Design a binder for this molecule. Structure first.
Ligand SMILES: O=C(O)CNC(=O)C(=O)O
Ligand SMILES: [Cl-]
Ligand code: NI
Ligand SMILES: [Zn+2]
Lengths: 8, 349
């Protein structure tokens, strides 16, 4: 896993 | 006791105070900073993390995201669409072009109104989540690549690397690029340094009122809530300060300038936007106080391979008395969001 700014 | 209003605090450490990162976090917590969910730390004038930013135009942004926003009346959903890789030179050109550049404005409140008026139009590109650091290797103070907090136990004990969480990320912003309402993965702290460029503006809700924001958001987006308890962790939800006001949610705002650090605290909801072309660096970190938040974090289940950290090593090392209780599922500790981390005892005595 990794950190994300955001999805869709 | 301290910071009873839970307002965002700003700190101006001397170089001597600045040197020990974990120690200074304990200090700002002794002054009640954590109650706001967000704090600013202005580093000493002598301090610089990098001599020059002249050599980064060739740096690659492997997965820039176009931010499509849908909604009205202070409630929006942001869809982040991955575009093809581009260089910082290519990104800056687009960011400063007539089509994407910051609008003209007088007072900050004017720029903020334009943000909330125009955020669904002319979707920008955010050069987000880039693996890397712009700190020079010799910089020992507040180095986002090596803060030396107890979050290091994850990699030390298990060998596990979680990009952006226990490694650094860069963020190349343009006007009207946004970060949705969220707390950090596992409700960790975060650190954010604005290396250069135009400001980044933040909103924050005190951790003591976090549950109130969640209840509100669940009502505003009932379908998303029924499909995932922790749907705010999707980082797609934007809510204006006028909406927060209208529904009695306490919050504060603050603008981060080039050269300034922001700290977010466990379970401190935050959101914001970039004013124009800029570059930020960020990672997560922990203190002993975080461990209980980690144990109790409500996580997103509905998406695959979301960030989940095993708390076992932390409970064993720092809460040996509660370990068996916790493994039996009987650890009913209630978090007091007002309490500073144990390490602040030094400054409270
Ligand atoms: O800068 C951004 O896009 C958002 N940053 C954060 O959420 C943080 O530092 O915790
Ligand atoms: Cl919905
Ligand atoms: Ni964050
Ligand atoms: Zn989910």
């Amino acid at each position: 896993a990794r950190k994300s700014t955001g999805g869709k | 006791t301290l910071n009873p209003s839970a307002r965002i605090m700003t700190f101006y450490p001397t170089m001597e105070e600045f040197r020990n990162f974990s120690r200074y976090i304990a200090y700002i917590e002794s002054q009640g900073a954590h109650r706001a969910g967000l704090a600013k730390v202005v580093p000493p004038k002598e301090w610089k993390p990098r001599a020059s930013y002249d050599d980064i135009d060739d740096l690659v942004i492997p997965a820039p995201i176009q931010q499509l926003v849908t909604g009205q009346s202070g409630l929006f959903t942001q869809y982040n669409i991955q575009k093809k890789a581009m260089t910082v030179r290519e990104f800056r050109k687009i960011a400063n072009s007539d089509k994407y550049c910051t609008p003209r404005y007088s007072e900050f409140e004017e720029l903020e109104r334009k943000y909330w008026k125009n955020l669904t139009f002319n979707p920008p590109i955010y050069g987000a989540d880039v693996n890397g650091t712009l700190y020079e290797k010799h910089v020992d103070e507040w180095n986002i690549g090596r803060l030396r907090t107890i979050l290091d136990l994850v990699e030390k004990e298990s060998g596990i690397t979680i990009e952006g969480v226990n490694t650094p990320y860069l963020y190349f912003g343009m006007w009207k690029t946004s970060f949705a309402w969220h707390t950090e993965d596992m409700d960790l702290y975060s650190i954010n340094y604005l290396h250069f460029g135009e400001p980044k503006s933040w909103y924050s809700v005190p951790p003591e009122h976090g549950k109130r924001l969640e209840r509100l958001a669940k009502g505003f987006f009932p379908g998303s809530a029924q499909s995932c308890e922790a749907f705010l962790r999707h980082k797609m939800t934007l809510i204006s300060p006028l909406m927060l006001k209208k529904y009695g949610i306490p919050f504060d705002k603050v603008t981060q300038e080039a050269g300034e650090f922001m700290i977010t605290f466990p379970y401190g909801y935050h959101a914001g936007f970039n004013h124009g072309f800029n570059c930020a660096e960020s990672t997560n970190f922990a203190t002993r106080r975080w461990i209980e938040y980690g144990k109790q974090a409500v996580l997103c289940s509905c998406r695959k391979d979301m960030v989940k950290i095993s708390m076992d090593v932390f409970v064993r090392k720092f809460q040996p008395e509660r370990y068996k209780l916790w493994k039996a599922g009987k650890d009913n500790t209630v978090i007091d969001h007002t309490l500073p981390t144990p390490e602040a005892a030094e400054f409270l005595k």
